[PDB]
């Protein structure tokens, strides 16, 4: 694979070549792949086998996960990036208690 | 010691702009 | 995503934002997502792409996993929470040998 | 050293109360 | 979930409550779950949602995985258990180079 | 330091003896 | 499972018995399994349940993943192996920034 | 401390040469 605007990788703190789970709201597909960065603005491109799991225009949610010890886990707040129809970031924040944004 | 897995970050509802089956890279 | 009554997260020791495997007894679907806590009692709500993998009323089993060294693993007992039709906890215990509850 | 993965906990047979496709959050 | 004869868990070194990948040779299904031990000899029983992914008589392969540092990984040999039609162990060994058994 | 994942063990071609959808446990 | 020419395992730095994600460009299948090495040149053979997820001639992408601390992750470059129609390596390199090869 | 997962390596577009359902090994 998933080639993603480097701006969105930066905003979400997802590294190039990081494993991500991608889920497609339109068709319900769920898969794992790794990211590739592109300088081309607004791009979210599914390459290879993943191409069969989406069509242009589909809405996807791209997630990265990490492992924590129990103590660190208690206080960790995930980073969330929201975008507009052009894949431009509109909000970058961290989750608060009870899914608050 | 015991490790658990949390969501680290997410990009919510991005739009797919291209789907390239035959990608070489 | 899965928004879950904070009472059930507390009972199971699953943290908000923890990765969980969710399996649907009605339709056989199996997926991974992360939890969101809600103060609203009895709620188990599938958001986003996961919405396509269940209907209201479906029975689901929600599991979290952890990594252990070999020695700790020998003696670890998972936490199990059973609920009624209203998603109210009816039993909270730990597994004993041979799946005993 | 070698790590293995165990079930940590489970909620057994909860009932789905809602399924919200277009959730923003 | 998968309830497995404790004899087979012992032979394979898979712990009760360990995460396993189960694949079904008959129908191609692939899933992850955790083990439950039973004293009942020869039993391999799929409980819960997993019940929809097999029928009695199906042949399954049950695998556990572990994480290693690079040095340990070089010399590790996985344990393999073969069984007969009654799920009685017929061979317990470790993989050698080139999938040799 | 970098961890990688290997197959730890397997049970090869066991026969399913029962499939219990409504299992409570 | 997946039996792979030891030359390709060597080139990619994937160990025998390492967990791999395999995705099939022809049919979109995605699965995880482990590798088996073979001395037989050019072989990529899907054994067991995985046999139902490909046909001879299908193009597959075989990936291994690893866990890193945040600092090491910043500078890690994955290894990539390209092959010809006979599964002979044509290029072995590491990813550079922006998916450059 | 926090671990994250990267692609370690890949073999790109290999051709399947055989598919052996009944493999014993």
CA G48, distance to chain mean position in Å, is: 18
Q: Is F25 on the interface with E (CB under 8 A)?
A: yes
Count H helices and E strands in chain B, helices first: 0, 2
Question: Resolution of the deposited coordinates, in angstroms?
Answer: 1.7
Q: Give all strands of the β-sheet with H18-20 in edge-to-edge order.
A: G36-38, G3-5, G44-47, H18-20
Residue E51 to residue A97: CA distance in whole angstroms: 36
Q: Do A82 and D24 touch (CB under 8 A)?
A: yes
Query: Token pair of E56, please?
Result: 């009695």
Q: Do C72 and B2 touch (CB under 8 A)?
A: yes
Residue A12 to residue A79: CA distance in whole angstroms: 6
DSSP E3-71: EEEHHHHHHHTPPTTBEEEEEETTT--EEEEE-EEESSTT-EEEEGGGGGG--TT-EEEEEEEEEEEHH
Q: Do G25 and B24 touch (CB under 8 A)?
A: no
Q: Do F17 and E62 touch (CB under 8 A)?
A: no
SS3 of C88, please?
coil
Handedness of CA E93, E94, E95, E100 (dihedral sign): negative
Handedness of CA E27, E32, E36, E41 (dihedral sign): positive
Query: Token pair of G21, please?
Result: 């994600």
Residue A55 to residue A35: CA distance in whole angstroms: 18
Query: Token pair of C95, please?
Result: 């597994």
Q: Which residues pair with D19 in a beta bridge?
A: C46
- Our CA-based measurement puts residue D2 at a distance from the nearest CA of chain E, in whole angstroms, of 5
Q: Give all strands of the β-sheet with C44-47 in edge-to-edge order.
A: C36-38, C3-5, C44-47, D18-20
Neighbours of chain G (3+ CB pairs under 8 A): A, B, E, F, H
Residue E18 to residue D20: CA distance in whole angstroms: 33
CA D18, distance to chain mean position in Å, is: 15
Q: Do G49 and E24 touch (CB under 8 A)?
A: yes
Burial of E92 (C-beta count, 10 Å sphere; 0-12/13-18/19+): middle
The single residue listed with the structure tokens 């969105």 is A8
Which are the catalytic amino acids of G?
Answer: 1, 34
Residue D4's contacts (CB-CB under 8 Å, 6 or more residues apart) are: C67, C68, C70, C73, E15, E18, E64, E66, F8
Q: Tell me if residue C17 is catalytic.
A: no
Residue C13's contacts (CB-CB under 8 Å, 6 or more residues apart) are: C64, C79, D8, D9
Asked whether residue G48 is marked as a ligand-binding residue, the answer is yes
Q: Do E25 and H21 touch (CB under 8 A)?
A: yes
- Our CA-based measurement puts residue B10 at a distance from the nearest CA of chain A, in whole angstroms, of 4
Burial of C72 (C-beta count, 10 Å sphere; 0-12/13-18/19+): middle
What is the DSSP secondary structure assignment for residue A15, as one 8-state letter? Answer: P
Q: Which of A28, A76, A98 sits opposite C52 (nearest CB)?
A: A28
Asked whether residue G54 is marked as a ligand-binding residue, the answer is no
Residue A73 to residue A69: CA distance in whole angstroms: 6
Do A81 and B12 contact (CB within 8 A), yes or no? yes
Q: Which residues pair with H4 in a beta bridge?
A: G68
Chain E CB contacts of C25 under 8 Å are 48-49
Do D14 and C44 contact (CB within 8 A), yes or no? yes
CA A26, distance to chain mean position in Å, is: 16
Q: Is E83 on the interface with F (CB under 8 A)?
A: yes
Give the helix, strand, coil percentages of chain G, each rounded to 5. Answer: 20, 45, 35
Residue A20, H or E segment: strand A19-24
What pairing do the DSSP bridges indicate for beta strands E59-69 and F3-15?
Answer: antiparallel
Residue-level length of chain B:
25
Task: Count how many pairs of residues, chain C against chain D, have C-beta atoms within 8 Å.
Answer: 133
- Our CA-based measurement puts residue A97 at a distance from the nearest CA of chain G, in whole angstroms, of 25
Residue C54 to residue C45: CA distance in whole angstroms: 10
Q: Do H24 and F13 touch (CB under 8 A)?
A: yes
Residue C63 to residue C8: CA distance in whole angstroms: 12
The single residue listed with the structure tokens 């317990």 is E92
Chain F CB contacts of D2 under 8 Å are 8
Query: Token pair of A58, please?
Result: 């589909």
Burial of C100 (C-beta count, 10 Å sphere; 0-12/13-18/19+): exposed
The CA radius of gyration of chain H, in Å to the nearest whole number, is: 16
Residue H15 to residue G20: CA distance in whole angstroms: 16
Burial of E73 (C-beta count, 10 Å sphere; 0-12/13-18/19+): buried
Residue A16 to residue A10: CA distance in whole angstroms: 9
Q: Tell me if residue C1 is catalytic.
A: yes
Within 1-25 of B, beta carbons closer than 8 Å to D belong to: 2-4, 12-13
Do G15 and F4 contact (CB within 8 A), yes or no? yes
Catalytic site residue from C17, C34, C65, C95: C34
Residue G2's contacts (CB-CB under 8 Å, 6 or more residues apart) are: G20, G22, G33, G34, G35, G36, G44, G45, G46, G47, G50, G62
SS3 of A39, please?
coil
Residue A45 to residue A3: CA distance in whole angstroms: 5
Residue G5 to residue E86: CA distance in whole angstroms: 35
Residue G74, H or E segment: helix G70-75
The domains located in chain A, with CATH, are: 2-101 (2.40.40.20)
Do H3 and A66 contact (CB within 8 A), yes or no? yes
Residue E59 to residue F16: CA distance in whole angstroms: 6
SS3 of C75, please?
helix
Residue D1's contacts (CB-CB under 8 Å, 6 or more residues apart) are: C69, C70, E69, E72
* CB-CB neighbours of G85 under 10 Å: 11
Asked whether residue A50 is marked as a ligand-binding residue, the answer is yes
What is the DSSP secondary structure assignment for residue A84, as one 8-state letter? Answer: -
Q: Which of F12, F17, F21 sits opposite E80 (nearest CB)?
A: F12
Do G9 and E71 contact (CB within 8 A), yes or no? no
Burial of G99 (C-beta count, 10 Å sphere; 0-12/13-18/19+): middle
Residue G34 to residue G8: CA distance in whole angstroms: 14
Chains B and F touch (3+ CB pairs under 8 A): no
Q: Is C73 on the interface with F (CB under 8 A)?
A: no
Query: Token pair of B6, please?
Result: 């949390």
Q: Which of F3, F8, F24 sits opposite D4 (nearest CB)?
A: F8
Residue H24's contacts (CB-CB under 8 Å, 6 or more residues apart) are: E82, F12, F13
Chain D CB contacts of B12 under 8 Å are 24
Q: Do C16 and A76 touch (CB under 8 A)?
A: no
Torsion of Cα atoms, G11 then G14 then G20 then G21, to 10°: -30
What pairing do the DSSP bridges indicate for beta strands A44-47 and A89-94?
Answer: unpaired
Residue D20 to residue C5: CA distance in whole angstroms: 16
The single residue listed with the structure tokens 């507009």 is A84
Residue E44 to residue E57: CA distance in whole angstroms: 10
Q: Which of H3, H16, H17 sits opposite G69 (nearest CB)?
A: H3
Residue C97 to residue E36: CA distance in whole angstroms: 8
Report angle CA C13, E37, B6 to the nearest 5 degrees.
25
* CB-CB neighbours of A55 under 10 Å: 13
Experiment type: X-ray
Residue D23's contacts (CB-CB under 8 Å, 6 or more residues apart) are: C47, C48, C51
Asked whether residue G11 is marked as a ligand-binding residue, the answer is no
Residue B24 to residue G86: CA distance in whole angstroms: 17
Q: Which of C23, C65, C77 sits opposite E48 (nearest CB)?
A: C23
DSSP F1-25: --EEEEEEEEEEEEEP-EEETT---
Do G59 and H15 contact (CB within 8 A), yes or no? yes
Q: Please, which contacts does C71-75 make with residues 24 or more away whose CB atoms are closer than 8 Å?
A: C72/B1, C72/B2, C73/D4, C73/D6, C73/E15, C73/E18, C74/E15
Torsion of Cα atoms, G61 then A18 then H2 then E33, to 10°: -40
* CB-CB neighbours of G98 under 10 Å: 13
Residue A34 to residue A20: CA distance in whole angstroms: 6
């Amino acid at each position: 694979x998933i080639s993603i605007d480097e701006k969105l990788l930066q905003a979400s703190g997802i590294l190039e070549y990081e494993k991500v789970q991608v889920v497609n709201v339109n068709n319900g597909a769920r898969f794992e792949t790794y990211t590739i960065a592109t300088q081309e603005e607004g791009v979210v491109c599914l390459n290879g086998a993943a191409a069969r799991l989406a069509e242009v225009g589909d809405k996807v949610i791209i997630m990265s996960y990490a492992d924590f010890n129990e103590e660190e886990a208690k206080t960790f707040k995930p980073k969330v990036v929201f975008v507009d129809e052009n894949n431009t970031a509109t909000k970058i924040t961290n989750y608060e208690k009870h899914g608050a944004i | 010691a015991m490790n658990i897995t949390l969501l680290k970050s997410k990009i919510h509802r991005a739009s797919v702009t291209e789907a390239r089956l035959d990608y070489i890279g």
